[PDB]
Enzyme design. Structure first.
Site, short mmCIF file in Angstrom:
data_model
loop_
_atom_site.label_atom_id
_atom_site.label_comp_id
_atom_site.label_asym_id
_atom_site.label_seq_id
_atom_site.Cartn_x
_atom_site.Cartn_y
_atom_site.Cartn_z
N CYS A 172 -24.50 19.06 -45.43
CA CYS A 172 -25.33 18.11 -46.15
C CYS A 172 -26.61 18.78 -46.64
CB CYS A 172 -25.66 16.93 -45.25
SG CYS A 172 -26.84 15.76 -45.93
N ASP A 180 34.26 42.77 -42.06
CA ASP A 180 35.40 41.95 -42.46
C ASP A 180 35.08 41.05 -43.65
OD1 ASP A 180 37.13 42.96 -40.49
OD2 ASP A 180 36.35 41.57 -38.99
N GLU A 181 33.91 41.19 -44.25
CA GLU A 181 33.49 40.40 -45.39
C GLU A 181 33.03 41.34 -46.49
OE1 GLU A 181 30.50 37.74 -44.05
OE2 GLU A 181 29.42 39.23 -42.86
#
Ligand SMILES: C[C@H](CCC(=O)NCCC[N+](C)(C)C[C@H](O)CS(=O)(=O)O)[C@H]1CC[C@H]2[C@@H]3[C@H](O)C[C@@H]4C[C@H](O)CC[C@]4(C)[C@H]3C[C@H](O)[C@]12C
Ligand SMILES: [Zn+2]
Ligand SMILES: [Zn+2]
Lengths: 49, 48, 49, 146, 215, 48, 83, 50, 110
Positions: free
Chosen positions: I5, I91-92
């Site tokens: 303030c 495996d992917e």
DNA sequence: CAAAATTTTCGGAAGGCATGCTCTGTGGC
DNA sequence: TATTTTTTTGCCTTCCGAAAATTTTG
RNA sequence: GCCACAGAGCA
């Protein structure tokens, strides 16, 4: 300072391992006749021998 | 002698399966190692 | 004969307090373990205990 | 807000790629998420291990915990070169893990392993153990050494 | 979206692989070619037209093998189901229990996705002659029996257990114990009093057999 | 265990206090002849 | 009814160190209480050394009752055991 | 390093001996105050132990 | 928000009030700052450290491919550098990285 | 459906515990 | 009578509101 | 004599 920890650890280990013995059927058992190992170390050979 | 878990004899075709492992495998391994050592000495003699 | 005799005398004798022997054989080397700082395979920042 | 985790495991402090002598690279991390690491894509879950043993007991079982105990104790002894026979280590690992779980060599562990009263009373918490034995009216067979 | 779809597909495919290996390891009849189902065939068979996981289609039933029913005469067919709901509600779990009871399945495997609620957890003792086992997809990503740490566990029949007790001359409370809800015990579906034989590999001697009893 | 008469909960509430024998709480003689020091158990028993 | 017959004995035929120690202690305690000896003692006075001489040529009248964990026992003559 | 003759055999030692004055201190820890033996003797009034 | 303030140099707090509109009010002295039509913001600029391009340098001396970049509305480049990498299970399928030679905007296909 | 009873989780406080044996001297009732 | 300091560190379980979460009523 | 306190010895 390491002697305190070593002594406490040895006391604990021996209070936990004192009851075991090799019975006459070559099975390691506790004092309450319960099996920990069926054959000591998997082969039943003494490290001392 | 190798017995199965049921309590009867094990056929020769499946003597080395995992489910038939007994408490006498240490003695058999010791005898096999002893025979292999003697065979190594005999093999050295035969080679020379 | 020598090999078989050595094998039969290397078996664990029944009645042996093998638990107490193991407890001592673990506890006693803790006394001679002096301080050392170890590192995990060439990494000088991990400091595994 | 700027202290929230948007990616990665919540218990992993850090991760380092280590290039070994063979030249192959291993990802070694500090943390407690064994299951999440071995479930992560790009990591072989059949070869991931931890030096912590209760983590291995929670993930894989009691026999894996026994192997972890034996391997860790043997590694600790062999680093200092104390030359302790492995059969004693196997006996310790079997004694820790023959009641179905990893007990531990403590007051709490012996309070579960041993059903004898005088053996537990002579170690620690004498009065508590004696009063519990009196209240529960348990029979102590004189079979142990102590 | 790649991250939202493909990662979930691969995750659930690995979970299906692990469930197949589990059911095969219990003595049920699953052919070998079914376990190595590739990701492309999995997408073409169990996934939606536009790429969504159809967990309702992938539930199935397994029947015991002739050798298994020879060793275990009381073994019956199981039903394994994957819950599409992210959190397990009582209604879906009660539906699963009702289906198991109505179809007279000996046991059922319930694979949930994220978490299971305690009220739904109370319904696994609900069927008296059948046992319901719960599994997590995150726990089924990799098979724990294929880990190098976990040795070979082989469940022993009642005849083999009696032979062991006669050989070592002991009562069943003297054997080493293995807890139920242990991951390997959950994998094998061990019941109370069942004896498991563990093939341990030690560098000191080689292969030796230990025994544990489920509590 | 309720099969024995001593197996009741009211046994675990102090109604009769067993005063221990004086062979386990002996009065320790001091260097002064007229006065003898007493164990703490005996003094606590008198206080009770 | 708990005695295993001699034909079906399954324990080891070798004398353990504990059996040797217990046998020597028992025989020394017996000799210290004026039991007769079965050896030509050459001026020995300590019971322990007399017991050692007795075990040297297997002239000791005792048997070892080895108790199996189930409850059955097993009688082994000391002269039969190999040391 | 001096060359010393052995007092037992009389011959020269085969190695030179490091020989000279060193200050030594006699400590208070002497065996006359450390030796102890009991056999049977006094016992505690409470535990009836030595 | 860290504002004070001007009348008493005490901390200013935002109050909802009866009207439902926030105001920078001071609980010590009668002071208010209305904020209708004014946007008050406090920015905490987090520290940014240098990061190495983990994919950088992997598109040098590699084969090219004829794949259209996703930003087709801005440019129509066809030739793009590409390479393979295994960051998943065995495996992917092996994943594929592409960099457009004209607009950048590096993307991984599958 | 939202109130309301019930169950589980999550912190903080409270006790318990920490090498072995051995030898003197001083002080206070 | 009432001014008024600490003098190891680490680990562990049990208890117990408090709060979050879940189930259960109306 | 009992009780604490203080120092000292050996790894
Ligand atoms: C201290 C720590 C939180 C730190 C803030 C918590 C959060 C993650 C927790 C571990 C995990 O739960 C896995 C595991 C479960 C077993 O049951 C007990 C052991 C394990 C190793 C746990 C120990 C401990 O409880 C951890 C590390
Ligand atoms: Zn103001
Ligand atoms: Zn482009």
């Amino acid at each position: 300072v390491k002697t305190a920890e070593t002594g406490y650890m040895s006391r604990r280990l021996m209070k936990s391992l004192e009851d075991l013995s090799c019975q006459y059927d070559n099975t390691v058992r506790t004092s309450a006749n319960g099996i920990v190992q069926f054959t000591y170390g998997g082969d039943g050979l003494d490290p001392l021998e | 002698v190798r017995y199965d878990n049921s309590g009867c004899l094990v056929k020769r075709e499946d003597l080395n399966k995992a489910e038939y492992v007994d408490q006498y495998d240490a003695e058999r391994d010791f005898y096999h190692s002893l025979r292999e050592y003697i065979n190594g000495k005999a093999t050295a003699l035969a080679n020379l | 004969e020598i090999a078989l005799f050595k094998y039969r005398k290397a078996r664990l004798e029944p009645g042996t307090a093998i638990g107490a022997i193991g407890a001592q054989s673990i506890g006693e080397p803790g006394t001679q373990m002096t301080l050392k700082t170890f590192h995990f395979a060439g990494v000088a920042s991990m400091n595994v205990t | 807000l700027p202290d929230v985790v948007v990616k990665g495991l919540p218990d992993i402090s850090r991760a380092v790629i280590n290039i070994r002598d063979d030249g192959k690279r291993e990802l070694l991390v500090e943390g407690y998420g064994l299951r999440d690491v071995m479930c992560t894509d790009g990591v072989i879950g059949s070869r991931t291990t931890t030096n912590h043993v209760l983590e291995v007991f929670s993930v894989l079982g009691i026999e894996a915990a026994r192997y972890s105990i034996i391997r860790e104790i043997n590694y600790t002894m062999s680093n200092h070169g104390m030359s302790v026979d492995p059969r004693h280590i196997q006996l310790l690992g079997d004694v820790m893990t023959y009641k179905g779980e990893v007990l531990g060599i403590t007051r709490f562990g012996l309070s579960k392993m041993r059903d004898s009263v005088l053996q537990l009373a002579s170690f620690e918490k004498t009065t508590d153990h004696l009063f519990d034995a009196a209240f529960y009216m348990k029979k102590d067979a004189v079979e142990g050494v102590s | 979206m790649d991250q939202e779809n493909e990662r979930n597909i691969s995750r659930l495919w690995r979970a299906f692989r692990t469930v197949k290996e589990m059911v095969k390891d219990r003595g049920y009849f699953i052919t070998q070619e079914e376990v190595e189902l590739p990701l492309e065939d999995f997408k073409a068979k169990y996934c939606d037209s536009m790429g969504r996981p159809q967990r309702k289609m992938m539930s199935f039933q397994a029947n015991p093998t002739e050798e298994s029913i020879s060793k275990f005469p009381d073994m019956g067919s199981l039903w394994v189901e994957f819950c599409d709901e992210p959190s397990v509600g009582v209604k879906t779990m009660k539906t699963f229990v009702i289906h198991i009871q109505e179809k007279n399945f000996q046991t059922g495997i319930f694979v949930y996705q994220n978490n299971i609620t305690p009220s739904a957890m109370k319904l696994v003792p609900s069927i008296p002659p059948a046992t319901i086992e719960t599994f997590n997809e995150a726990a089924l990503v990799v098979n724990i029996t294929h880990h190098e740490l976990v040795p070979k566990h082989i469940r022993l029949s009642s005849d083999e257990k009696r032979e062991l007790l006669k050989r070592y001359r002991l009562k069943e409370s003297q054997l080493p114990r293995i807890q139920r809800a242990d991951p390997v015990a959950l994998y094998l579906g061990l019941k109370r009093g069942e004896v498991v034989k563990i093939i341990r590999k030690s560098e000191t001697s080689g292969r030796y057999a230990s025994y544990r009893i489920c509590m | 265990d309720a099969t024995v008469p001593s197996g009741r909960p009211e046994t675990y509430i102090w109604r009769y206090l067993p005063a221990p024998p004086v062979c386990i709480r002996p009065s320790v003689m001091m260097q002064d002849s007229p006065a003898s020091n007493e164990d703490d158990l005996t003094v606590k028993l008198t206080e009770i | 009814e708990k005695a295993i017959p001699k034909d079906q004995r399954a324990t080891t035929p070798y004398m353990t160190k504990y059996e040797r120690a217990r046998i020597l202690g028992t025989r020394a305690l017996q000799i210290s209480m004026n039991a007769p000896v079965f050896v030509d003692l050459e001026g020995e006075t300590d019971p322990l050394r007399i017991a050692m001489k007795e075990l040297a040529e297997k002239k000791i009248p005792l048997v070892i009752r080895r108790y199996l964990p189930d409850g059955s026992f097993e009688d082994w003559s000391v002269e039969e055991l190999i040391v | 390093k001096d060359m010393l003759y052995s007092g037992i055999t009389g011959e020269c030692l085969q190695a030179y001996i490091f020989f000279g004055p060193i200050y030594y201190q006699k400590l208070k820890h002497m065996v006359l105050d450390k030796m102890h033996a009991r056999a049977r003797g006094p016992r505690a009034v409470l535990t009836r132990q030595p | 928000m860290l504002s004070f303030c001007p009348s008493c140099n005490n901390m200013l707090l935002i109050t909802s009030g009866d009207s439902g509109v926030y105001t920078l009010a001071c609980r010590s002295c009668p002071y208010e700052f209305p904020i209708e039509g004014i946007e008050i913001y406090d920015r905490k600029k987090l520290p940014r450290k240098e990061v190495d391009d983990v994919l950088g340098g992997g598109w040098d001396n590699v084969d090219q491919t004829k794949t259209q970049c996703p930003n087709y509305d801005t440019c129509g480049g066809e030739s793009a550098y590409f390479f393979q990498l295994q960051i998943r299970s065995a495996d992917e399928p092996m994943t594929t990285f592409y960099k457009c030679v004209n607009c950048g905007h590096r993307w991984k296909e599958n």
